[PDB]
Amino acid sequence: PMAETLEFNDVYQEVKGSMNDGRLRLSRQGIIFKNSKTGKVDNIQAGELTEGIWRRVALGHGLKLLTKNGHVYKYDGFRESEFEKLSDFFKTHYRLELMEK
């Protein structure tokens, strides 16, 4: 079932063991994460993405993304059941296929 946006208000950015809680939002154009505590926003354009990985992490499952400029983004705390919709979104809108690891 196709969706143009996906929202996750209960996930974290993982940075060196730190779990930064925030809001993740996927649109056709890309990805925005906003750190709840610090308010720090990170934008990722669909075009920038070269790699998407889905794997078990410390809490549930997580995405690990790579962009053309070498930046790494890790968003953790997904229930495993989210794979289908995430995989679907990436393949449909981002023209990239999540690697299951």
The angstrom resolution of this structure is 1.8
In which region does residue 67 sit, left (phi positive, over 0), alpha (psi from -120 to 50) or beta (all else)?
beta
DSSP-assigned letters across all residues of 37-101 = TT--EEEEEGGGEEEEEEEE-SSSEEEEEEETT--EEEEEEE-GGGHHHHHHHHHHHSS--PEE-
Distance CA 86, CA 42 (A): 19
Distance CA 58, CA 64 (A): 13
Q: How many domains does the chain have?
A: 1
Structural domain range at position 51: 1-101
